[PDB]
Ligand binder design. Structure first.
Ligand SMILES: [K+]
Ligand SMILES: [Mg+2]
Ligand SMILES: [Mg+2]
Ligand SMILES: [Mg+2]
Ligand SMILES: [Mg+2]
Ligand SMILES: [Mg+2]
Length: 91
RNA sequence: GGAUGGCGAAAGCCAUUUCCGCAGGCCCCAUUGCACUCCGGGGUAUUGGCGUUAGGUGGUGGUACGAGGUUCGAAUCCUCGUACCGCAGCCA
């Protein structure tokens, strides 16, 4: 089911944070406006990223487009998030 | 952190240190993991800096003391330098 936030995983853990977001914003920013991209390299967050678009139509489209797209030698696996990203909910 | 020395009852502050450790470098093991304050672990390198909230320059706000101005005089308001705390970046 739909969500303002796509969740990517199977991302190269080697890529540094700031360098990762750049590229992610570079790719997804074209499927529509992005409210933010969340990235952390914790023991449980690495490899995963939370892209937050501003309109569901963006996430959903970006989802069908990029699923499996090569990224630093690793097919991006994406799917909606499980829950409205903090900012979204409030709004 | 330790240990030793200095002023102290202490706290704290200074110092030395082929005791241990931290951030930067380089390799390594582990994790496929729905989060929104962060946060796995190890080896080697280790001059300098620092001490577990653990490196730095220049910059923004704060806190402190100092100086110049304001002022009859200021404890007010102004700007400035210095130390430190949280910020961002950048560099290690
Ligand atoms: K020493
Ligand atoms: Mg001691
Ligand atoms: Mg002593
Ligand atoms: Mg001491
Ligand atoms: Mg290191
Ligand atoms: Mg004065």
């Amino acid at each position: 089911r739909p969500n303002h936030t796509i969740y990517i995983n199977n991302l190269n853990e080697k890529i540094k944070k700031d360098e990762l977001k750049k590229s992610l914003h570079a790719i997804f920013s074209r499927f529509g406006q992005i409210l933010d991209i969340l990235v952390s390299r914790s023991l449980k967050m690495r490899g995963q990223a939370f892209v937050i678009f501003k309109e569901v139509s963006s996430a959903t489209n970006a989802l069908r487009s990029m699923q499996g797209f090569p990224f630093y030698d690793k097919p991006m696996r994406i799917q909606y998030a499980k829950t409205d990203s903090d900012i979204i909910a409030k709004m």
